[PDB]
Structures are given as structure tokens and as C-alpha cells.
């Protein structure tokens, strides 16, 4: 069995590269961040432009939703993150502290905390209610490419060009584990599986890997695509069949069978690097976004 994703909508509006797309937890919206300094909100089902959210002084590399779908947090070249009230489009807090581009961000499931990763080589943990930085982790020795909380918020996983994936205790700030597979290619993305037991990691040698966190062992590798230069988002698709979904530098969305590691679909349409993919939380819907020669977001839908 293989999925049958087909192009449904193309969302045009950003005037520079799109950097990241994410579906709201309640399934109603898609948020996109862009090098054009804007966040845009679109209807998840109809692809309809809802609104533009502005305030950052420079382009934005990542955006993420709170668990109740009411807030967004954005990560910008202007060295700040901003927490936004989605309904009003207003900036509630500006999180200041990083000393170089902020590259990645995420809320914990409780959504009382935000974690951020930066080109300043640190990971920061922020109090959402007060806007205060709780911890500054000296996490890596090169830019931090991804940060993500596990299912109960007790752990944070980070990745870096230094070739490491590290797992941190949210409460104590202690580094609990370092994962590396003998060779040290730059790690460009990392994310916990929905059950918290695995970590999916991308490295800049055209390779994705599924790690068992507890055993600290690589279990599966996914290959065939192109990833040498960019920090591309990958996903666990779980609404239908169990797939791995990723962008690629040859302008395609790749879908692998999680268990067999076989490529099952390659989605054509984008005209530049697909930097970001996202999966709808309840329906078989994928969002993809591409870099500056393309500037569009695409919504793809499937029966399984």
C-alpha cells in the first residue's frame, strides 16, 4: 500500500523564500514564515489567505504553534523571537537574549515554555507567561539547526552543524544524551516521534535516520533524495499509512514507507528547493514550501 498525494492548492503571497510551514493543532490553519519578514495564516482546508502578521525587522527562519492554537512563536534573523496572538495579529512579547540569528523554535506540549536554537550555538528555554529566559544551554559548538520537545515536555532534543544530536532534561537543563553515528556530518534537522520513543535526524549527506532514543541506536535510514546544503524539515505522517515525509534540494517532496525504507511517492510541482514540509494533525494533508525562485506553498491531499 502506498499513499496517493495529489496537488490541491498553491498558496501565493510571500515575496521572498518561504522558510517554514506548520499546521495548527486544532487543524484549522496553516502558518507560514518567510524571508520577507512576514508570517501569513491560511485556511488548512481551502488554502484561503486569512491574514498577515508583521513586526520582525528581518526575515524569519521558523514558526511554531501553541497547543491551544491561540499563539505563534517566530524565530528571526533580527536576533529575537516573538510571541503572537493569532486572532489579533498582535505581538505579545519579544524574546530577547540571543546574539545571532534565531533559527528554530517550538512550544512544549503544556505551552508554558518555548525552546529556541540559534546561530549563536546556544539553546534557550523561555517562560511564555513572563517572557523571561529560564535557561541558556551551552548546547553545541556550531549553529543549532533544530529544537523539539517530547510528548510530555520532559525532554528537549537539539541538533547542530557540529554533527551532534543532544537530548536535554527540561527541568534541570542537564545534557542527558549525545547521539552520533561514528561519522560527524552536520545534523540539519531533528525531531521526536509522536510517542517520544524515537528521534528522526537529517544529516547533510542526503540521509535521514530513525534513532531509538533509549538504546541510542540507529534503526532505519532513508535515502535517495538530495540534502547537502539546507536545513530541511522532515515529519512522521501518521493520519493514514505510516510514512516519513521530507523536502529535498531537487525541488521534490519525498515520502518513504517508515517500516520498509522504500520511497513510495515523490511530489512534483515546486520550482526551487523544498525547505519545509508539514503534516495535518487529523487529515491526510501535507503542506510544502520552497525557496526564493519559487516562493509558493502547496497543499497536497491523499486518501491514505
Amino acid at each position: 500500500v502506498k499513499p496517493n498525494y495529489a496537488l490541491k492548492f498553491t498558496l501565493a503571497g510571500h515575496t521572498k523564500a518561504v522558510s517554514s510551514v506548520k499546521f495548527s493543532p486544532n487543524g484549522e490553519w496553516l502558518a507560514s514564515s518567510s524571508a520577507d519578514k512576514l508570517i501569513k495564516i491560511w485556511g488548512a482546508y481551502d488554502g484561503k489567505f486569512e491574514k498577515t502578521i508583521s513586526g520582525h525587522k528581518l526575515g524569519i527562519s521558523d514558526v511554531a504553534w501553541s497547543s491551544d492554537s491561540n499563539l505563534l512563536v517566530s524565530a528571526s534573523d533580527d536576533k529575537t523571537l516573538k510571541i503572537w496572538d493569532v486572532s489579533s495579529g498582535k505581538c505579545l512579547k519579544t524574546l530577547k537574549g540571543h546574539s545571532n540569528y534565531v533559527f528554530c523554535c517550538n512550544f512544549n506540549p503544556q505551552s508554558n515554555l518555548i525552546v529556541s536554537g540559534s546561530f549563536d550555538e546556544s539553546v534557550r528555554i523561555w517562560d511564555v507567561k513572563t517572557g523571561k529566559c529560564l535557561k541558556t544551554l551551552p548546547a553545541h559548538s556550531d549553529p543549532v539547526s533544530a529544537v523539539h520537545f517530547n510528548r510530555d515536555g520532559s525532554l528537549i532534543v537539539s541538533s547542530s552543524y557540529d554533527g551532534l544530536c543532544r537530548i536535554w532534561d527540561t527541568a534541570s537543563g542537564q545534557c542527558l544524551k549525545t547521539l552520533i553515528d561514528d561519522d560527524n556530518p552536520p545534523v540539519s534537522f531533528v525531531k521526536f516521534s509522536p510517542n517520544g520513543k524515537y528521534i528522526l535526524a537529517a544529516t547533510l549527506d542526503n540521509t535521514l535516520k530513525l534513532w531509538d532514543y533509549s538504546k541510542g541506536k540507529c534503526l532505519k535510514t532513508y535515502t535517495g533524495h538530495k540534502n547537502e546544503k539546507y536545513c530541511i524539515f522532515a515529519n512522521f505522517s501518521v493520519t493514514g499509512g505510516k510514512w516519513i515525509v521530507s523536502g529535498s534540494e531537487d525541488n521534490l517532496v519525498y515520502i518513504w514507507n517508515l517500516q520498509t525504507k522504500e520511497i513510495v511517492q515523490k511530489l512534483q510541482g515546486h520550482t526551487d528547493v523544498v525547505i519545509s514540509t508539514a503534516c495535518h494533525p487529523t487529515e491526510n494533508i501535507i503542506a510544502s514550501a520552497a525557496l526564493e525562485n519559487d516562493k509558493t506553498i502547496k497543499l497536497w491531499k491523499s486518501d491514505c
Binding site: 528581518l58 526575515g59 527562519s61 540569528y101 526564493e292
Partner: peptide, 13 residues
């Protein structure tokens, strides 16, 4: 300054 406008949209050299 990143010419494309943000860090993620620049290639790693």
C-alpha cells in the same frame, strides 16, 4: 546579513 533575507534560506558553505 543574509542576502536571501533569513538564515534558513541560505546554503551552508
Amino acid at each position: 546579513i543574509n542576502p536571501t533575507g533569513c538564515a534558513r534560506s541560505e546554503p551552508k558553505i
